[PDB]
Write a protein that binds this ligand. Structure first.
Ligand SMILES: CCOC(=O)CP(=O)(O)[C@H](CC(C)C)NC(=O)[C@@H](NC(=O)[C@@H](NC(=O)CC(C)C)C(C)C)C(C)C
Ligand SMILES: *[C@H]1O[C@H](CO)[C@@H](O)[C@H](O)[C@@H]1O
Ligand SMILES: *[C@@H]1OC[C@H](O)[C@@H](O)[C@@H]1O
Length: 323
């Protein structure tokens, strides 16, 4: 049975988490994203000036082209990428996927052209939303899951410290106590789950659903919950330059918790201070609006407090506080 550990590392302010992946002999630094299902990489098919500052994949060296296949993806912050497809060997923490579909970028939007922290994305949402056309492909996880000791992966993302992605096994030393599991609705291809209630500092409210998404920096909630949270933070104000609600960095923030199948997942107010707003002397809050989409995004701010198991059997999600 195969299992492996890949180490992730946060970039500045934990804006994103990158982990090395070897593709056809070359190691690239990718952003592992449980919110999408495409494995796409910077490649030699991009303009030479955009390859600058990246580790790039060269398909001709080792990949097998899928003639006529293309991919095109667009994300929630408006960024996008597109290209063609090859199959190659992909290794993550010593687990190798032979014949994994690798999406070689031919075009990338400015957001990606500006980010030299990563060389592409490894999607870990359900393969049902993979964008490859005319026939969709399986994520790295779906490709290897029958070979793992257990068909699951787990994640510990940390604040300014290296974390891990465990594939095929659960590391009990990464959390306190026992895991609590909840059912996943994979109908829109996400690791979607329900919360029965929430408490934002001194205010509590009714439940909602959200997705566990390693690829999103913040915890994005309904405007109503955002308002209630910041109404308790002295002097909090929106700052379009910073990207949402900001406050004096020294402010004492209330905690935020959700009740999931009887387990209280709590994000301590210190994790809600994301960092310098990069606009004067204030800090950006880790809780911001989901722009009215109807469901919450449990991004890195939330994940930094938990050890999370993504189990294909059910499917289900297990939660426990990070040790
Ligand atoms: C399948 C569709 O699902 C999604 O698109 C959500 P994802 O997690 O796949 C995507 C990955 C990102 C790398 C584009 N993340 C996103 O699109 C989210 N983008 C973000 O969280 C961006 N982070 C920031 O802007 C940091 C700033 C908030 C202080 C990226 C640079 C990490 C938006 C939801 C705010
Ligand atoms: C993950 O689990 C596998 C299967 O037991 C081990 O062989 C591997 O060393 C790692 O513990
Ligand atoms: C990244 O890979 C393997 C180990 O578990 C971890 O300690 C390392 O930093």
């Amino acid at each position: 049975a195969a299992s492996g550990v890949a180490t992730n590392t946060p970039t500045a302010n934990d804006e994103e988490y990158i982990t090395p992946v070897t593709i056809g002999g070359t190691t690239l630094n990718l952003n592992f994203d449980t919110g999408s299902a495409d494995l796409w990489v910077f490649s030699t098919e991009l303009p030479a000036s955009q390859q600058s500052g990246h580790s790039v994949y060269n398909p001709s060296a080792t990949g097998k082209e899928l003639s006529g296949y293309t991919w095109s993806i667009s994300y929630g912050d408006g960024s996008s990428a597109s290209g063609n497809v090859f199959t190659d060997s992909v290794t993550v923490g010593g687990v190798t996927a032979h014949g994994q579909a690798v999406q070689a970028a031919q075009q990338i939007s400015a957001q990606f052209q500006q980010d030299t922290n990563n060389d592409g994305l490894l999607g870990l949402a359900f393969s049902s939303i993979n964008t490859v056309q005319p026939q969709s492909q399986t994520t790295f996880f779906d490709t290897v899951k029958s070979s793992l000791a257990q068909p699951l992966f787990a994640v510990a993302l940390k604040h300014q410290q290296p974390g891990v992605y465990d594939f095929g096994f659960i590391d009990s030393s990464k959390y306190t106590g026992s895991l609590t599991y909840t059912g996943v609705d994979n109908s829109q291809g996400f690791w979607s789950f329900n919360v029965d209630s929430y408490t934002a500092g001194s205010q509590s409210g009714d439940g909602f659903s959200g997705i566990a998404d390693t690829g999103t920096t913040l915890l994005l909630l309904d405007d109503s919950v955002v308002s209630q949270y910041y109404s308790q933070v002295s002097g909090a104000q929106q700052d379009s330059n910073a990207g949402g609600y900001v406050f004096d960095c020294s402010t004492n923030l209330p905690d935020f918790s959700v009740s999931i199948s009887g387990y209280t997942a709590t994000v301590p107010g210190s994790l809600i201070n994301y960092g310098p707003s990069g606009d004067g002397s204030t800090c950006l809050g880790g809780i911001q609006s989901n722009s009215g989409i109807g469901f919450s995004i449990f991004g890195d701010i939330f994940l930094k407090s938990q050890y999370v198991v993504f189990d294909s059997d059910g499917p289900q999600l297990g939660f426990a506080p990070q040790a």
